[PDB]
Design a protein around this ligand. Structure first.
Ligand SMILES: COc1cc(C(=O)N2CCOCC2)ccc1Nc1nc(NC2CCCCC2)c2c(C#N)c[nH]c2n1
Length: 260
């Protein structure tokens, strides 16, 4: 199996992921260099689905000028039937990597944290609130974390369901949402990265897992730990009132990010 894209040919190693009309492949260029290739079959997709993807490509194209914690987009080809995006290939996504791990280097957790803050900070500066952040949105490449999805396009699942653990409260209470909402979801990823579980992984019953998230008089537990700065970061990310929740520019000024 192969794929030509704006001139070049690529051997399809394997298929990383699926979703709707999309597929992601690990591939090699003619020079045994490795890459990822996203394929969208446009054959039918409502002009909402269509415009979703055009918006992703544009932002991905603009944003990578501003931060190397966004995935690279090396080249692309668009027509009425298909899309091909040639991107830098990750070693793996945070979600899969997390679930294999338990030995979680604290120096590495800290560094992945700044990684995610820079990425999300970058999209916030160009007016995007992802508002569905989760570990599967981050790729480990070069011992670094890089954001992939921007929340605009249909995200994908791995290939051999997804969660609600990372939902911000004001997301729920909104069905009768700011940059603050990504702060929540980043908190859940850090919480998970420190305590080895997300806040409400507890409640396995979804229709009420949601309750806990919405509920003020329901306390998330914060076991004391050596890094109490890290404890404090989780404490200010996971505040249910977005107005009282810490901002990204504040997070980048917090001792946990800035000392040692
Ligand atoms: C070596 O390659 C990868 C392997 C794995 C992996 O270990 N497994 C096993 C478990 O099941 C999933 C695959 C994960 C991500 C890899 N690298 C990668 N993945 C990308 N997308 C996937 C991310 C996560 C969900 C499915 C799509 C994109 C992308 C886009 N879009 C641009 N560059 C990308 N690089």
């Amino acid at each position: 199996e192969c794929i030509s894209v704006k001139g070049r040919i690529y051997s399809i190693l394997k298929q990383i992921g699926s979703g709707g009309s999309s597929k992601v492949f690990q591939v090699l260029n003619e020079k045994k260099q490795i890459y990822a290739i996203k394929y969208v079959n446009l054959e039918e997709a409502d002009n909402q689905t269509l415009d979703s993807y055009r918006n992703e490509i544009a932002y991905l194209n603009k944003l990578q000028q501003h931060s190397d914690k966004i995935i690279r987009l090396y080249d692309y080809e668009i027509t009425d039937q298909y899309i091909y995006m040639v991107m830098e290939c990750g070693n793996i996504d945070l979600n899969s990597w997390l679930k294999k791990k338990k030995s979680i280097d604290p120096w590495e957790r800290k560094s992945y944290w700044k990684n995610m803050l820079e990425a999300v900070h970058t999209i916030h500066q160009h007016g995007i609130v992802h508002s569905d952040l989760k570990p599967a949105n981050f790729l480990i490449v070069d011992g670094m974390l890089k954001l992939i999805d921007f929340g605009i396009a249909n995200q994908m699942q791995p290939d051999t369901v997804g969660t609600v653990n990372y939902m911000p409260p004001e997301a729920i209470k909104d069905m009768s949402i700011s940059p603050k909402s990504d702060v929540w979801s980043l908190g859940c990823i850090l919480y998970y990265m420190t305590y080895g579980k997300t806040p409400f992984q507890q409640i396995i019953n979804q229709i009420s897992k949601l309750h806990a998230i919405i509920d003020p008089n329901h306390e998330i537990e914060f076991p004391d730990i050596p890094e109490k700065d890290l404890q404090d970061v989780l404490k200010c990310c996971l505040k249910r009132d977005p107005k009282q929740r810490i901002s990204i520019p504040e997070l980048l000024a917090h001792p946990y990010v800035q000392i040692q």
